[PDB]
């Protein structure tokens, strides 16, 4: 499992500098080596989110959750996957869906950042 984590980290470093092609290629190698790890998939979802491809981001998040449900110990990462789907809807101003997925996320694992994002989306929707 060692090499996969090395590949993931080189991908993370690239992602942060906005070098998305490099990030995807290293995450691909990490997935090839450790296919039951949903983190490499959610990381690829982050890359598409930042490229503005919200649909692909959500497709990957759904995929990650599928993989994660197999290993019944990833509740925190599943919460993260749901939150990312929520964020992608938020970016597109599709607030009802953003709120709905933040709730799915919170039910798995409550986090202050997701709660804050949800409250923000709730305030925007309520006013509308």
């Amino acid at each position: 499992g060692k090499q996969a984590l090395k590949e993931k980290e080189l991908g993370n470093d690239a992602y942060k500098k906005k070098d998305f092609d490099t990030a995807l290629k290293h995450y691909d190698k990490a997935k090839e080596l450790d296919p039951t790890n949903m983190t490499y998939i959610t990381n690829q979802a982050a890359v598409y989110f930042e490229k503005g491809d919200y649909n692909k981001c959500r497709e990957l998040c759904e995929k990650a959750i599928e993989v994660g449900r197999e290993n019944r110990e990833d509740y925190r990462q599943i919460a993260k996957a749901y939150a990312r789907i929520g964020n992608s809807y938020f970016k597109e101003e599709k607030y009802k869906d953003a709120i709905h997925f933040y709730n799915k996320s919170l039910a798995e694992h409550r986090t202050p950042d997701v709660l804050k994002k949800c409250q923000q989306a709730e305030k925007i929707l309520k006013e509308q």
Binding site: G11, N12, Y15, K16, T39, T42, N43, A45, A46, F49, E50, Q77, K80, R84, N87
Partner: peptide, 5 residues
């Protein structure tokens, strides 16, 4: 940016 793990 979105957070990576």
């Amino acid at each position: 940016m979105e957070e990576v793990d």
